[PDB]
Every structure is written in structure tokens, then in C-alpha cells.
Amino acid sequence: ATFEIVNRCSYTVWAAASKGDAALDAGGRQLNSGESWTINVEPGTNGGKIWARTDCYFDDSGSGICKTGDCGGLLRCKRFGRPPTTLAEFSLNQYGKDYIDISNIKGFNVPMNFSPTTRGCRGVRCAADIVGQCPAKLKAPGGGCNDACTVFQTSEYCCTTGKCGPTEYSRFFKRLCPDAFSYVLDKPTTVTCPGSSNYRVTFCPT
Structure with missing residues (x-):
């Protein structure tokens, strides 16, 4: 499947694409405003994610650091990034269907739209000013709005026992972005698309 990743933000981002144990395609790239x-993502890919990283510095060998979404100091990510990270998530060609969603379970850094470029399903968006409105206890110094699990590390926020409910913190993300996951056992906002669809991820869509 083809994914087009577009940076409509006024600032540079470093896109990342990974399935946790390996890079998808090159795994990461600088995107100036408008780029x-x-x-290309192999059919059958389960548990892929795309995210943006902000305020990165890399050397000529592709080693460095980012203030959000850092994936072990590499330009080309093999592994998932450090919160906070707005996440585009996908599983492809699962018994004839593709499944897509946006998640705030690992916090929020950049607004995002995740839409099909082929026919047969709808897209999803989280484009509200979550960073601006972020509760004081969740604000990350480097930028972005952390999830409550990352900050407090409790069984309730992290849903460790498989039993957990919504919280004051999860409800904040859900209020601003209803179509994204706000906690692990949230009512699913997953969209079902025809198998082998193609997609576009836009940072700062509005």
C-alpha cells in the first residue's frame, strides 16, 4: 500500500514510520513546511504506526535527538517513539480488510488527519489545540501534552489489569478529539476500509 505523508505545519517535522521491531520503508525523513x-508498506503489515517528531538535531550519520517522538536517537526509526506522540495506527489486509485509527493513548504533539485516497471508507482527524489547553500536570516541557499513564504510571491510567475506566485526564483528550482513542479500553473509533486501500497522513490539516 502507498502512504503519502504531508507536512502542512508552518514548522519542520521529522516523520517516522515503524511497526515496532522494524522500519517501514526508510523509517523516517525531514519534512519542511509543505513537503x-x-x-510503500508491505501488504499484511500488522501494528504499523506513523508519527511526527519536533525539534530534532541530527548529524551526518543520522544520529541525534528530538524533543517529541524520539526513537532511540535515530533519523530512520526502527522502534516506536517516546511520548508525547499523536499516532496514526494501521493493520493491513486482515482477512480482507484494512483497519485505521488515530490514538491519543501516548499523548499528543501535532494535529493530524488520516484519510484514504481510494474509495470505500471515511477518514479520521484530531486537529484541536490540545497542547494549548493541556492540563498543567500533563504538559511536557519539550512541547506536547502527555497521557496520564506516561506521567503517573498507575494501574488505572495504564489499564494494567485489563480493567480500567475513563478518567478526568482521558476525558480531556476525548472532549477535544472524539474520533481518537483517549484510553486503552475506550469505545473503538477504528475505521474499516477495503483491503489494499491507499492513504494520506496530513500534519496540521487545518
């Missing part, structure tokens, strides 16, 4: 990056 588009097209990647």
Missing part, C-alpha cells in the same frame, strides 16, 4: 513523502 510530501511517499512510502
Whole structure:
């Protein structure tokens, strides 16, 4: 499947694409304002994610650091990034269907739209000013709005026992972005698309 990744933000982001134990395509790239990056993702990929990183510095070997979404100090991510990270999540060609969603379970850094470019399903968006409105206890110094699990590390926020409810913190993310996951056992906002659909991820869509 093809994914087009577009940076419509007024600032540079460093896009990342990974399935946790390996890079998808090149795994990461700088995107100046307005730039588009097209990647190819193998059919059958389970548990892929795309995210943006902000305020990165890399050397000529591709080693460095970012203030949000850092993936072990590499430009080309093999592994998932450090919160806070707005997440585009996908599983492809699962018994004839693709499944897509946006998640705030690992916090929020950049607004995002995740839409199909082929027919047969709808897209999803989280484009509210979560960073601006972020509760004081969840604000990350480097930028962005952390999830409550990352900050407090409790069984209730992290849903460790498989039993957990919504919280004052999860309800904040849900209020601003109803179509994204706000906690692990949230009512699913997953969208079902035809198998082998193609997609576009836009940072700062509005």
C-alpha cells in the first residue's frame, strides 16, 4: 500500500514510520513546511504506526535527538517513539480488510488527519489545540501534552489489569478529539476500509 505523508505545519517535522521491531520503508525523513513523502508498506503489515517528531538535531550519520517522538536517537526509526506522540495506527489486509485509527493513548504533539485516497471508507482527524489547553500536570516541557499513564504510571491510567475506566485526564483528550482513542479500553473509533486501500497522513490539516 502507498502512504503519502504531508507536512502542512508552518514548522519542520521529522516523520517516522515503524511497526515496532522494524522500519517501514526508510523509517523516517525531514519534512519542511509543505513537503510530501511517499512510502510503500508491505501488504499484511500488522501494528504499523506513523508519527511526527519536533525539534530534532541530527548529524551526518543520522544520529541525534528530538524533543517529541524520539526513537532511540535515530533519523530512520526502527522502534516506536517516546511520548508525547499523536499516532496514526494501521493493520493491513486482515482477512480482507484494512483497519485505521488515530490514538491519543501516548499523548499528543501535532494535529493530524488520516484519510484514504481510494474509495470505500471515511477518514479520521484530531486537529484541536490540545497542547494549548493541556492540563498543567500533563504538559511536557519539550512541547506536547502527555497521557496520564506516561506521567503517573498507575494501574488505572495504564489499564494494567485489563480493567480500567475513563478518567478526568482521558476525558480531556476525548472532549477535544472524539474520533481518537483517549484510553486503552475506550469505545473503538477504528475505521474499516477495503483491503489494499491507499492513504494520506496530513500534519496540521487545518
